[PDB]
Short mmCIF file of C-alpha atoms and ligand atoms in Angstrom, two decimals:
data_model
loop_
_atom_site.label_atom_id
_atom_site.label_comp_id
_atom_site.label_asym_id
_atom_site.label_seq_id
_atom_site.Cartn_x
_atom_site.Cartn_y
_atom_site.Cartn_z
CA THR A 1 5.10 -15.59 -23.61
CA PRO A 2 3.56 -18.54 -21.71
CA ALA A 3 1.64 -21.29 -23.54
CA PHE A 4 -1.66 -20.82 -21.65
CA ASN A 5 -1.78 -17.57 -19.64
CA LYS A 6 -5.07 -18.45 -17.90
CA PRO A 7 -6.13 -20.11 -14.59
CA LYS A 8 -4.98 -23.68 -14.00
CA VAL A 9 -5.57 -26.64 -11.75
CA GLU A 10 -2.79 -28.93 -10.55
CA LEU A 11 -3.42 -32.20 -8.69
CA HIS A 12 -0.06 -33.97 -9.05
CA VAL A 13 2.85 -31.98 -7.51
CA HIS A 14 5.21 -32.85 -4.61
CA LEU A 15 5.86 -30.55 -1.67
CA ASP A 16 9.21 -32.15 -0.86
CA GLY A 17 9.93 -32.05 -4.60
CA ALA A 18 9.07 -28.35 -4.97
CA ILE A 19 11.30 -26.62 -2.42
CA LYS A 20 13.33 -23.57 -3.37
CA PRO A 21 17.10 -24.00 -3.87
CA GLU A 22 17.53 -20.84 -1.75
CA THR A 23 15.55 -22.37 1.13
CA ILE A 24 17.44 -25.68 0.97
CA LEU A 25 20.65 -23.66 1.23
CA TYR A 26 19.36 -21.60 4.16
CA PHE A 27 18.72 -24.65 6.35
CA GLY A 28 21.83 -26.52 5.32
CA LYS A 29 23.82 -23.59 6.64
CA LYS A 30 21.61 -22.88 9.67
CA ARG A 31 21.57 -26.52 10.85
CA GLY A 32 25.15 -27.28 9.94
CA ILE A 33 23.98 -30.20 7.82
CA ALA A 34 25.75 -30.87 4.52
CA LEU A 35 24.61 -30.26 0.90
CA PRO A 36 26.09 -31.39 -2.46
CA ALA A 37 26.77 -27.70 -3.37
CA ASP A 38 27.42 -24.38 -1.64
CA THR A 39 25.61 -21.84 -3.80
CA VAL A 40 21.99 -21.76 -4.96
CA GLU A 41 22.99 -22.06 -8.63
CA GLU A 42 25.41 -24.95 -8.05
CA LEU A 43 22.79 -26.57 -5.87
CA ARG A 44 20.15 -26.20 -8.60
CA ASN A 45 22.40 -28.01 -11.07
CA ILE A 46 23.19 -30.94 -8.81
CA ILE A 47 19.67 -31.50 -7.48
CA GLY A 48 18.21 -31.01 -10.96
CA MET A 49 18.24 -33.38 -13.94
CA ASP A 50 19.10 -32.47 -17.51
CA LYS A 51 18.56 -35.87 -19.06
CA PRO A 52 16.39 -39.00 -18.75
CA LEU A 53 17.43 -41.38 -15.98
CA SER A 54 15.08 -43.82 -14.25
CA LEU A 55 12.52 -43.81 -11.45
CA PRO A 56 15.11 -45.10 -8.90
CA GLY A 57 17.61 -42.66 -10.41
CA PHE A 58 15.28 -39.72 -9.88
CA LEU A 59 14.46 -40.87 -6.35
CA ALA A 60 18.10 -40.54 -5.23
CA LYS A 61 17.83 -36.76 -5.58
CA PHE A 62 15.83 -36.45 -2.34
CA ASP A 63 18.82 -37.78 -0.36
CA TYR A 64 20.64 -34.58 -1.30
CA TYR A 65 18.38 -32.17 0.56
CA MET A 66 15.72 -33.90 2.62
CA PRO A 67 18.09 -34.30 5.65
CA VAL A 68 18.16 -30.52 5.95
CA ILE A 69 14.35 -30.01 5.87
CA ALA A 70 13.22 -33.12 7.75
CA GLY A 71 13.13 -32.57 11.49
CA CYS A 72 12.89 -28.74 11.50
CA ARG A 73 9.45 -27.29 12.32
CA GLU A 74 10.24 -23.90 10.84
CA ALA A 75 11.46 -25.53 7.58
CA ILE A 76 8.48 -27.85 7.09
CA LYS A 77 6.03 -24.95 7.48
CA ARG A 78 8.15 -22.54 5.45
CA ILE A 79 8.27 -24.76 2.33
CA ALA A 80 4.49 -25.15 2.62
CA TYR A 81 3.90 -21.37 2.69
CA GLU A 82 6.43 -20.79 -0.14
CA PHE A 83 4.85 -23.55 -2.23
CA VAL A 84 1.55 -21.70 -2.49
CA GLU A 85 3.35 -18.50 -3.47
CA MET A 86 5.21 -20.38 -6.24
CA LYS A 87 1.93 -21.73 -7.63
CA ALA A 88 0.00 -18.47 -7.44
CA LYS A 89 2.71 -16.98 -9.68
CA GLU A 90 2.08 -19.83 -12.13
CA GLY A 91 -1.59 -18.96 -12.52
CA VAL A 92 -2.71 -21.96 -10.49
CA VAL A 93 -6.04 -21.15 -8.79
CA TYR A 94 -6.35 -24.61 -7.22
CA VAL A 95 -3.68 -27.19 -6.28
CA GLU A 96 -3.34 -30.41 -4.35
CA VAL A 97 0.18 -30.96 -2.97
CA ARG A 98 1.42 -34.40 -2.04
CA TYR A 99 4.05 -35.42 0.44
CA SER A 100 4.98 -38.34 2.70
CA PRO A 101 4.59 -37.12 6.30
CA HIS A 102 6.86 -39.87 7.60
CA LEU A 103 9.74 -38.72 5.41
CA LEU A 104 9.86 -35.28 7.09
CA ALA A 105 9.55 -36.58 10.67
CA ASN A 106 12.23 -37.45 13.21
CA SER A 107 10.27 -39.14 16.00
CA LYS A 108 7.76 -42.00 16.12
CA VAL A 109 8.97 -43.35 12.74
CA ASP A 110 10.54 -46.83 12.91
CA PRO A 111 12.86 -46.71 9.99
CA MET A 112 14.29 -43.26 10.89
CA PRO A 113 14.56 -41.38 7.58
CA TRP A 114 17.78 -39.76 6.36
CA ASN A 115 19.81 -41.09 9.32
CA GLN A 116 18.21 -38.37 11.42
CA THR A 117 19.06 -38.05 15.08
CA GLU A 118 15.97 -38.58 17.28
CA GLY A 119 13.88 -35.44 17.75
CA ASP A 120 10.29 -34.56 18.61
CA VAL A 121 8.75 -33.99 15.16
CA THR A 122 6.03 -36.64 14.77
CA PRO A 123 4.54 -37.65 11.37
CA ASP A 124 1.31 -36.16 12.73
CA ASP A 125 3.24 -33.01 13.63
CA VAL A 126 4.45 -32.59 10.06
CA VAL A 127 0.85 -32.81 8.87
CA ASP A 128 -0.10 -29.98 11.23
CA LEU A 129 2.92 -27.86 10.18
CA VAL A 130 2.08 -28.29 6.48
CA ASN A 131 -1.57 -27.39 7.12
CA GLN A 132 -0.60 -24.09 8.75
CA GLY A 133 1.76 -23.17 5.92
CA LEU A 134 -0.66 -24.05 3.12
CA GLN A 135 -3.50 -22.27 4.90
CA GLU A 136 -1.40 -19.13 5.42
CA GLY A 137 -0.38 -19.42 1.77
CA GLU A 138 -4.05 -19.51 0.71
CA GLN A 139 -4.98 -16.38 2.67
CA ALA A 140 -1.79 -14.60 1.64
CA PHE A 141 -1.95 -15.29 -2.11
CA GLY A 142 -5.58 -16.03 -2.95
CA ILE A 143 -5.62 -19.58 -4.31
CA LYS A 144 -7.22 -22.72 -2.88
CA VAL A 145 -4.64 -25.23 -1.60
CA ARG A 146 -5.25 -28.79 -0.37
CA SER A 147 -2.91 -31.65 0.58
CA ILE A 148 -2.57 -35.42 -0.06
CA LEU A 149 -0.64 -37.84 2.19
CA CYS A 150 1.64 -40.36 0.41
CA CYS A 151 2.07 -44.04 1.29
CA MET A 152 5.59 -45.14 0.33
CA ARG A 153 5.75 -48.31 -1.81
CA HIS A 154 8.73 -49.62 0.16
CA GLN A 155 7.17 -48.97 3.61
CA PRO A 156 3.66 -50.49 3.99
CA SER A 157 3.84 -50.30 7.80
CA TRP A 158 3.41 -46.52 7.52
CA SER A 159 0.26 -47.00 5.45
CA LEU A 160 -2.47 -47.57 8.06
CA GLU A 161 -0.99 -44.59 9.88
CA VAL A 162 -1.24 -42.41 6.75
CA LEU A 163 -4.92 -43.48 6.59
CA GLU A 164 -5.48 -42.15 10.11
CA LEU A 165 -3.83 -38.82 9.31
CA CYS A 166 -6.15 -38.39 6.29
CA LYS A 167 -9.09 -39.16 8.57
CA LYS A 168 -7.96 -36.81 11.29
CA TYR A 169 -7.27 -33.90 8.94
CA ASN A 170 -10.15 -34.62 6.54
CA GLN A 171 -10.66 -31.53 4.34
CA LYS A 172 -8.65 -29.61 6.97
CA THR A 173 -6.29 -29.58 3.96
CA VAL A 174 -5.92 -33.37 3.50
CA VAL A 175 -8.24 -34.43 0.67
CA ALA A 176 -6.82 -37.83 -0.38
CA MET A 177 -4.28 -40.63 0.09
CA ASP A 178 -1.57 -41.52 -2.45
CA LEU A 179 0.88 -44.36 -3.13
CA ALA A 180 4.25 -43.06 -4.32
CA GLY A 181 7.78 -44.36 -4.52
CA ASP A 182 9.63 -46.97 -6.52
CA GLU A 183 7.10 -48.65 -8.84
CA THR A 184 9.79 -51.12 -9.97
CA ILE A 185 9.35 -52.97 -6.67
CA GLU A 186 7.53 -56.07 -7.98
CA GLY A 187 4.12 -56.37 -6.32
CA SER A 188 4.49 -53.38 -3.97
CA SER A 189 0.97 -52.22 -4.83
CA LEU A 190 -0.31 -55.36 -3.15
CA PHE A 191 1.58 -55.35 0.14
CA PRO A 192 -1.05 -55.97 2.88
CA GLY A 193 -0.26 -52.65 4.56
CA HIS A 194 -1.06 -50.72 1.39
CA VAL A 195 -4.08 -52.87 0.51
CA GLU A 196 -5.56 -52.54 4.00
CA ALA A 197 -5.09 -48.78 3.90
CA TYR A 198 -6.99 -48.27 0.64
CA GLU A 199 -9.73 -50.75 1.59
CA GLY A 200 -10.17 -48.69 4.73
CA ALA A 201 -10.19 -45.46 2.73
CA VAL A 202 -13.11 -46.87 0.72
CA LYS A 203 -15.02 -47.77 3.89
CA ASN A 204 -14.38 -44.29 5.32
CA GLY A 205 -14.91 -42.14 2.23
CA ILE A 206 -11.29 -40.99 2.09
CA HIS A 207 -10.36 -40.20 -1.52
CA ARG A 208 -7.69 -42.32 -3.21
CA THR A 209 -5.03 -41.67 -5.87
CA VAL A 210 -2.25 -44.09 -6.91
CA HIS A 211 0.90 -43.89 -9.06
CA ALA A 212 0.74 -46.61 -11.66
CA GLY A 213 1.69 -47.13 -15.26
CA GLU A 214 4.40 -44.51 -14.90
CA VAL A 215 7.11 -47.12 -15.36
CA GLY A 216 5.19 -50.32 -14.54
CA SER A 217 3.00 -52.40 -16.83
CA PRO A 218 -0.77 -51.87 -17.31
CA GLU A 219 -1.12 -54.78 -14.87
CA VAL A 220 -0.03 -52.43 -12.09
CA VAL A 221 -2.72 -49.93 -13.18
CA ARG A 222 -5.18 -52.79 -12.87
CA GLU A 223 -4.01 -53.49 -9.29
CA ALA A 224 -4.53 -49.82 -8.47
CA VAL A 225 -7.98 -49.89 -10.04
CA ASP A 226 -9.30 -53.30 -8.95
CA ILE A 227 -7.65 -53.86 -5.58
CA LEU A 228 -6.66 -50.36 -4.44
CA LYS A 229 -9.83 -48.66 -5.80
CA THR A 230 -8.21 -45.45 -7.12
CA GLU A 231 -10.37 -42.60 -8.29
CA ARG A 232 -7.41 -41.13 -10.17
CA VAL A 233 -4.18 -42.54 -11.60
CA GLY A 234 -0.82 -40.77 -11.24
CA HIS A 235 0.87 -40.98 -14.64
CA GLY A 236 -0.75 -44.05 -16.24
CA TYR A 237 1.06 -43.80 -19.59
CA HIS A 238 1.34 -47.58 -19.89
CA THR A 239 -2.39 -48.25 -19.46
CA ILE A 240 -2.73 -47.92 -23.25
CA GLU A 241 -0.64 -51.07 -23.76
CA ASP A 242 -3.67 -53.04 -22.61
CA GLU A 243 -6.39 -51.74 -24.97
CA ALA A 244 -9.22 -53.42 -23.02
CA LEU A 245 -8.12 -51.83 -19.72
CA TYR A 246 -7.52 -48.49 -21.39
CA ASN A 247 -10.94 -48.24 -23.07
CA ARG A 248 -12.54 -49.60 -19.87
CA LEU A 249 -10.92 -46.83 -17.80
CA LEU A 250 -11.74 -44.43 -20.65
CA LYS A 251 -15.40 -45.45 -20.61
CA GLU A 252 -15.33 -45.06 -16.78
CA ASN A 253 -14.09 -41.47 -16.92
CA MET A 254 -10.86 -42.39 -15.15
CA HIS A 255 -8.79 -39.30 -14.44
CA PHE A 256 -5.15 -39.45 -15.39
CA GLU A 257 -2.69 -37.15 -13.62
CA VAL A 258 -0.28 -36.52 -16.50
CA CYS A 259 3.18 -34.98 -16.08
CA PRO A 260 4.75 -34.45 -19.58
CA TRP A 261 8.25 -33.22 -18.66
CA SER A 262 8.50 -35.60 -15.68
CA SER A 263 7.76 -38.61 -17.87
CA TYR A 264 10.68 -37.63 -20.12
CA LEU A 265 13.24 -37.17 -17.35
CA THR A 266 12.34 -40.37 -15.44
CA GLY A 267 12.32 -42.49 -18.57
CA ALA A 268 8.61 -43.25 -18.09
CA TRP A 269 8.18 -42.04 -21.66
CA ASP A 270 10.25 -43.23 -24.59
CA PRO A 271 10.92 -39.98 -26.53
CA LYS A 272 11.23 -42.05 -29.73
CA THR A 273 7.48 -42.67 -29.40
CA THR A 274 4.40 -40.44 -29.44
CA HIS A 275 3.46 -39.44 -25.86
CA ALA A 276 0.46 -41.20 -24.29
CA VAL A 277 -1.12 -37.84 -23.57
CA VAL A 278 -1.54 -37.28 -27.33
CA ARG A 279 -3.75 -40.41 -27.47
CA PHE A 280 -5.48 -39.18 -24.29
CA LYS A 281 -6.13 -35.85 -26.01
CA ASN A 282 -7.43 -37.47 -29.20
CA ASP A 283 -9.70 -39.81 -27.22
CA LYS A 284 -11.13 -36.91 -25.16
CA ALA A 285 -9.89 -38.64 -22.01
CA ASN A 286 -10.25 -37.08 -18.58
CA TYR A 287 -6.72 -35.91 -17.67
CA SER A 288 -4.57 -33.05 -16.34
CA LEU A 289 -1.15 -31.49 -16.95
CA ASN A 290 1.02 -31.51 -13.81
CA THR A 291 4.62 -30.66 -12.91
CA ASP A 292 5.39 -33.41 -10.36
CA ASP A 293 8.77 -32.21 -8.97
CA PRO A 294 9.63 -28.71 -10.34
CA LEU A 295 12.72 -28.64 -8.10
CA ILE A 296 14.39 -31.80 -9.39
CA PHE A 297 13.07 -31.16 -12.90
CA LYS A 298 14.15 -27.52 -12.98
CA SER A 299 10.70 -26.56 -14.23
CA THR A 300 7.53 -24.50 -13.78
CA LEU A 301 4.01 -25.31 -14.97
CA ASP A 302 4.68 -23.55 -18.27
CA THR A 303 7.28 -26.24 -18.99
CA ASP A 304 4.63 -28.93 -19.47
CA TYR A 305 2.20 -26.69 -21.32
CA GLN A 306 4.81 -25.39 -23.82
CA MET A 307 6.02 -28.96 -24.35
CA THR A 308 2.47 -30.11 -25.17
CA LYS A 309 1.97 -26.99 -27.28
CA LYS A 310 5.13 -26.99 -29.43
CA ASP A 311 5.27 -30.75 -29.79
CA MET A 312 2.06 -32.81 -29.41
CA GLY A 313 -0.20 -30.01 -30.77
CA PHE A 314 -2.26 -28.86 -27.75
CA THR A 315 -4.59 -25.86 -28.34
CA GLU A 316 -5.95 -23.25 -25.94
CA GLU A 317 -9.24 -25.12 -26.18
CA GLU A 318 -7.75 -28.39 -24.97
CA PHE A 319 -6.07 -26.56 -22.07
CA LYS A 320 -9.41 -25.11 -20.87
CA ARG A 321 -11.15 -28.47 -21.24
CA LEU A 322 -8.24 -30.24 -19.54
CA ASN A 323 -8.43 -27.85 -16.58
CA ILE A 324 -12.20 -27.96 -16.22
CA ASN A 325 -11.74 -31.75 -16.11
CA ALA A 326 -9.18 -31.41 -13.29
CA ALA A 327 -11.65 -29.22 -11.39
CA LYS A 328 -14.45 -31.79 -11.74
CA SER A 329 -12.09 -34.65 -10.82
CA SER A 330 -10.59 -32.79 -7.84
CA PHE A 331 -10.97 -34.21 -4.33
CA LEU A 332 -12.90 -31.16 -3.13
CA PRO A 333 -16.46 -31.27 -1.69
CA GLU A 334 -19.31 -30.41 -4.11
CA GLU A 335 -19.82 -26.86 -2.83
CA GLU A 336 -16.14 -25.89 -3.18
CA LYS A 337 -15.86 -27.70 -6.50
CA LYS A 338 -18.73 -25.58 -7.89
CA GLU A 339 -16.99 -22.43 -6.71
CA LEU A 340 -13.92 -23.56 -8.66
CA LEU A 341 -15.83 -24.29 -11.84
CA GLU A 342 -17.40 -20.82 -11.54
CA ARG A 343 -13.92 -19.26 -11.34
CA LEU A 344 -12.62 -21.14 -14.37
CA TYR A 345 -15.72 -20.41 -16.46
CA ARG A 346 -15.72 -16.75 -15.44
CA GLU A 347 -12.04 -16.24 -16.22
CA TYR A 348 -12.09 -18.33 -19.39
CA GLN A 349 -14.43 -16.00 -21.28
O1 DCF B 401 6.32 -37.18 -1.89
C1 DCF B 401 6.57 -38.46 -1.34
C2 DCF B 401 7.65 -39.21 -2.13
O2 DCF B 401 7.23 -39.53 -3.47
C3 DCF B 401 8.41 -39.61 -4.30
N1 DCF B 401 8.07 -39.01 -5.60
C4 DCF B 401 8.28 -37.73 -5.96
N2 DCF B 401 8.12 -37.56 -7.26
C5 DCF B 401 7.80 -38.81 -7.77
C6 DCF B 401 7.76 -39.73 -6.77
N3 DCF B 401 7.19 -40.97 -6.65
C7 DCF B 401 7.03 -41.74 -7.66
N4 DCF B 401 6.94 -41.43 -8.96
C8 DCF B 401 7.59 -40.33 -9.70
C9 DCF B 401 7.30 -38.95 -9.14
O3 DCF B 401 5.73 -38.64 -9.30
C10 DCF B 401 9.55 -38.90 -3.53
C11 DCF B 401 8.91 -38.38 -2.27
O4 DCF B 401 9.78 -38.61 -1.15
ZN1 ZN B 402 4.42 -37.85 -8.30
#
């Protein structure tokens, strides 16, 4: 019995972090590229985490399988189509999937990812492949699916290029720009390449979202807010350590993309302490419950909801409110956003 068997909205989930173990296996075999395990079950266990690690610790999991997906046109599109299917089955009526286009490419990328051998798959090409898959997934399963292109904290040179992709494919799936990666890199939020990209997004009406306060101090959330101009904040658990910033963001209707299970596994959340989302709930903050990387976390959307239900005390009421809030704070145009709110309100009666 799921915790909330009613329509949901997810804004914070990773394409490259939500691939099926079966599909990873398929391509490892088909391409003759190696994997840390030979069966889907053994692969699940080695790519997945059972206990809290660290942000850098969690990031090492992509090395296991990315090499097998990156560079193959049929793989990139396939995981996009299968993603939608996975969400539809979760009750998700609207989702925004994030991914770094450069990390799946094998041509026109200076630091060649995963030691790939030169190919013809351009970062731009991966954006077009993902669009097709998500769009076929929408038609095929009946849920609205949009994408978000991720700037990598350790590679600011890719940033202005991400900005262009968001411009080029504006609303043709791409709805916003993100900043993901290793938040422990002191001052990465402020690298000129990242800064320039967000400043440009503001001048061009491209929506912005930034990971901050996941593992970093509230000072990083302030960089995201003041310099980067985020509309939303990925994670943001640490914002509450700076009361003034918290209540300021609270009073500004800042949307927090919360991922309960994720925060536990990465170490972002000290389990010995009451989760930030409980304060968020009690303060009637504008937030959402997201999965982040179901693959690496061995989870589904019901994992976060149950967690917040059994522990933390979330009610059906708070789930509806929380989802309506995600709908309002989505990066969709007004017309489409209304359509969404109609769906939720219709199916919430
Ligand atoms: O999708 C682009 C990149 O983002 C990383 N990424 C995936 N999940 C997370 C990441 N980034 C930072 N914080 C924790 C968690 O939300 C890996 C991936 O290659
Ligand atoms: Zn994330």
